[PDB]
Design a protein around this nucleic acid. Structure first.
Lengths: 102, 124, 58
DNA sequence: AAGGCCACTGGAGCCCATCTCCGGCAC
DNA sequence: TTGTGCCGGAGATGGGCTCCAGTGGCC
């Protein structure tokens, strides 16, 4: 599994909303608890030494692949820029509703 | 498949020689590996491997894929079969199988099958 | 005529499918780990990581 | 008896998607 | 900055994949 997909998995699971959630603005999301997110990624890939520093580098790696962009002026805020609509078959507002996004 | 750089690739297969040549040529011309990776749409790890191998070997050729090493056709077992045939050209494969055991060159697990013994006879 | 299974036995092939049932996020080496711990295969009968992925593809 | 036939194995090398270490730059 | 936060280069990893030498019942 790829990092961007893993985050999507977390973002479409209500029980994970205390550490990662949609901001409501399109496909923008926030790592409310960046360290919990890094820990789970480390567990999913069997990488005991994963940490936010490396997770963060992983996100920077997506910048020019036009998969994910980082929102300026804030910390822990990113935005999927690939066309999730086509992949998921859902619209942003539409998916947020299925997950009860404030 | 399509990698994250948008490049078409065949999982498990070597990058076509023509692309391999272009990677070496672009680096030769001064293009940064990260730029070669992005422009040709090849993972930087692959570009890194190809270039590293080229500076070290002079070749753009990928390694040899596939195959396996002998399991029963051990170097000693093979020489023993040859020694048996030289001693008695008419000895049969199953009789060879029996002498390999009777002399303990093989266990009931190591001993080559009749097919293998003849195959060994035929080839090496 | 070709050959018959030596490790991809119907029993091992069924357990692998069962392990993929519990959690598809398993790596090949992990299937080999449980397939070995639950004593479903002998350390000399356990499929290689390559076989396990071959079994999964088939 | 030996040879043709071929499903089955596992390790070889492959590219990918990171993992990891680290230098740059702005302040 | 003897630092913090963000960016991005490239050798190291190791996963599933295709390959294929090697093997062994069968006729």
């Amino acid at each position: 599994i790829q990092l961007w997909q893993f985050l999507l998995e977390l973002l479409t699971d209500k029980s994970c909303q205390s550490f990662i959630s949609w901001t409501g603005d399109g496909w923008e999301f926030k790592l409310s608890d960046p360290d919990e997110v890094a820990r789970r990624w480390g567990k999913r890939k069997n990488k005991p030494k994963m940490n936010y520093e490396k997770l963060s580098r992983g996100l920077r790696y997506y910048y020019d692949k036009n998969i994910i962009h980082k929102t300026a002026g804030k910390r822990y805020v990113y935005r999927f820029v690939c066309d999730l609509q086509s992949l998921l078959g859902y619209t942003p507002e539409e998916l947020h509703a299925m997950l009860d996004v404030k | 498949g399509v990698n994250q750089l948008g490049g078409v690739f065949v999982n498990g297969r070597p990058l076509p020689d023509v692309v391999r040549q272009r990677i070496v040529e672009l680096a030769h011309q001064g293009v940064r590996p990260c730029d070669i990776s992005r422009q040709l749409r090849v993972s930087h790890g692959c570009v890194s491997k190809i270039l590293g191998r080229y500076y070290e070997t002079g070749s753009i050729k990928p390694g040899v894929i596939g195959g396996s090493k002998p399991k029963v056709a051990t170097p000693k077992v093979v020489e023993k079969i040859a020694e048996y045939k030289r001693q008695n050209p008419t000895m049969f494969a199953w009789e060879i199988r029996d002498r390999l055991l009777a002399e303990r060159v093989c266990d009931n697990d190591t001993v080559p099958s009749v097919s293998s013994i003849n195959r060994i006879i035929r080839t090496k | 005529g070709g050959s018959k299974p030596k490790v991809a036995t119907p029993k091992v092939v069924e357990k692998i499918a069962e392990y993929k049932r519990q959690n598809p996020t398993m790596f090949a080496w992990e299937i080999r780990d449980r397939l070995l711990a639950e004593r479903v295969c002998d350390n000399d009968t356990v499929p290689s990581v390559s076989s396990i992925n071959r079994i999964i593809r088939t």
